[PDB]
Ligand SMILES: Cc1cc2nc3c(=O)[nH]c(=O)nc-3n(C[C@H](O)[C@H](O)[C@H](O)COP(=O)(O)OP(=O)(O)OC[C@H]3O[C@@H](n4cnc5c(N)ncnc54)[C@H](O)[C@@H]3O)c2cc1C
C-alpha cells in the first residue's frame with residue numbers, strides 16, 4: 001500500500017486523483033485544496049453574458065470522496081522532495097511516495113502599473129471564477145447604456161487562448177440585447193489571436209464589427225497592450241501611449257505557474273514547470289509530477305481539456321511507477337469551444353502524440369484544427385449545443 | 401503504443417465517462433457495436449460523413465486505434481438517458497417506428513446480445529437523433545437505400561410531426 005498526495009483540486013488535480021484511485025484503489029490518495037467549492041472558469045463567460053447562472057459553475061468534492069480520496073481543505077506551503085513531505089498552512093505534514101502538483105496559475109497583477117491583487121476587487125480579471133465572475137457580471141448589469149467595457153489580454157502564454165475573445169463575444173451578446181449603445185474594446189498584447197479569422201467573421205455578422213456602430217472593437221498588439229491603469233479614474237493606458245476611459249475594465253494580467261510550484265522549485269526561467277511528457281514527472285524534482293496550466297506541455301494550450309488529458313497520462317504513469325511497472329505510451333487531446341451567441345459557436349481541437357524520441361508533444365499530422373472560416377450555419381448552431389455537452393461531460397469526468 | 405484506455409479516456413470530455421454522455425446533445429457511445437463504431441470513425445476521418453468536429457478528431461488516429469477504442473466502448477454498459485420527452489406523442493411514435501424502422505432498428509436499435517450491427521436509437525439524446533436525421537435528409541452522411549425509402553415514406557405519410565413522434569418514442573425508452 002503506497003501513498004500519493006495531490007496538491008490542487010481543480011481540473012488537473014481532481015482528474016489525476018480520481019484516475020489514480022480508480023486504477024489502483026490500494027493507493028492512498030490525499031488531495032489538498034483550500035477552497036471547499038470549486039468554480040469552473042470554463043463556461044463562466046456564459047455567466048458574464050447572462051445566459052448561464054453562476055451557481056451552475058460550482059463543483060463539490062463529494063464525488064471524489066466517494067471514490068475513496070481523502071480531501072483536505074488547506075493550502076500546501078512547501079514540498080520537501082528529499083523527505084517526501086508536503087507541509088500545509090494548517091501545520092500538518094503529508095508523506096508521499098509520488099506527488100502530483102496542479103496548482104493552476106499565479107496572476108501577476110502588478111505587472112500592469114496601477115493594478116494589484118487587492119485592486120482586482122475594482123477591475124476584475126475573472127481569470128479564476130467565483131466572486132470574480134460575479135463582480136464582473138454585476139458591473140456589467142449596473143453599467144449605464146453607452147458605457148465602454150475594456151478587455152485587456154496579456155501576452156502569451158496564458159490560460160485559455162480564445163477565452164478573452166469568447167468573453168468579448170458574450171459581453172457583446174449582452175449589450176446587443178440590453179445596453180445597445182455600449183461597446184467592448186479589446187486592447188491586445190498580440191498581433192493575432194486564437195481562432196481570430198473565425199471570431200472576426202462572427203463579430204461581423206453578429207455585432208457590427210468593422211462599422212461605426214460596432215459592439216466590439218479589437219486593437220492589435222503590440223501598440224494596444226495595456227501597461228498602466230488608474231482604478232479611480234477608470235482609465236487604462238496602452239504601450240503606444242493612448243488612454244482609454246471605460247465604465248467596466250477587465251484586466252487579464254500576465255501569468256505563470258501557481259505560487260506553490262514556484263516556491264517548490266518546479267519552475268524554470270519561462271515561469272512554468274518543465275516535465276517529461278511521457279509521465280509529467282518534473283525535470284527538476286524526481287517523484288513530483290506537474291500537470292495542467294502550471295506545466296509546459298506545448299503545443300497543448302492551457303485549458304481544462306488539456307489539464308484533464310495530462311492528468312490521465314500522469315495518473316497512469318504514477319500508478320505504473322508505484323507498482324514497479326513501465327508507463328505506457330501517452331496519448332493526449334484538447335478541444336476549446338467558444339460560444340459567440342446562442343446559435344453561434346466555434347472550436348479548436350487537436351490530437352497529440354509524443355514525438356519519435358519521446359521528448360516533446362506534437363500534434364498528430366493532418367488532424368485537428370479550427371471550425372472552418374466558411375462553416376455553414378448548421379455547424380455554428382450545433383457547436384453551442386456540443387459546447388454545453390462538453391461542459392457537462394468534462395465536469396463529471398473530472399469531479400464525478 | 402497506447403492502450404485502449406489511454407486512447408479512449410480522452411473521449412470522455414465530449415462523450416462522458418465510459419461513453420455515457422450527460423447531454424444535452426453529444427451522443428452516448430457506450431456499448432456501440434464495434435464494427436459500427438470503426439466504420440463511423442473511418443467515415444468521419446475520410447470526410448464521407450460531414451461533421452462539426454469528429455473529422456478533425458478521428459484524423460488524429462489510426463485504424464488500429466479505432467479497433468482498440470471499439471473494444472473499449474463495446475465493453476461498456478449503455479445507459480438510456482434521463483431526458484424529457486413529449487409523453488402525448490409516445491403511442492403514435494411507437495406505431496411509426498413499428499411501421500417504418502423496426503425492420504432494421506430492432507427493439508429501437510438497443511444493444512442486444514443477438515443483434516449484430518445495431519444502431520442505437522432508444523434512450524439516445526434527442527437533439528443528437530434530430531441532428532442525425534437532418535444529416536441523412538441533407539445527405540451529409542450516407543444511408544442505405546432501404547433506410548432512405550422508409551424515411552421518405554414516413555415523411556410523405558406523417559410529415560415533421562411524424563419525426564416528433566418517433567423521437568418522443570425513442571426518448572421514452574429510459
Ligand atoms: C474565462 C475562461 C474560459 C475558459 N474556457 C475554457 C474552455 O472553453 N475550455 C477549456 O478546456 N478550458 C477553459 N478554460 C481553462 C481552464 O479554466 C483551465 O485551463 C483549467 O482549469 C486548468 O486546470 P488546473 O488544474 O491547471 O488549474 P485550476 O483548475 O485553476 O486548479 C488549480 C487548483 O489549485 C489550487 N491550489 C493552488 N495553490 C494551491 C496550494 N498551495 N495548495 C493547494 N491547492 C492549491 C487552487 O485553489 C485551484 O483550485 C477557461 C478559463 C477561463 C478563465
Ligand code: HEC
Pocket residue numbers: 440496497500501502503504505519520521529532533541542543544546547550551554566
Ligand atoms: C425509420 C423511420 C428509420 C429511422 C427513424 C432511422 N432509421 Fe436507420 N440506419 C440503418 C443503418 C445501416 C444505419 C447506419 C448508417 C451508416 O452507415 O452510418 C442507420 C442509422 C440510423 C441513424 C443514425 C444513428 C446514429 O447513432 O447516428 C438514425 C437516427 C436512423 N438510422 C434512424 C438502417 C436502417 C434500415 C435498414 C434496412 C431502415 C429501414 C432504417 N434504418 C430506418 C430508420
Ligand code: HEC
Pocket residue numbers: 333335349386390407408410411412413414415426427428429437440441451452453454455457469
Ligand atoms: C470536443 C468534442 C469531441 C471529442 C474530443 C470527441 N468527440 Fe466524438 N463526437 C463529437 C460530436 C459533436 C459528434 C457528433 C458529430 C460531429 O458533429 O462532429 C461526435 C460523434 C461521435 C460518434 C458517432 C456516434 C454515433 O452514434 O454514430 C463516435 C463513435 C464518436 N464521436 C467517437 C469518439 C471517440 C472514440 C472519441 C475520442 C477518441 C471522440 N469521439 C472524441 C464530439 C467529440
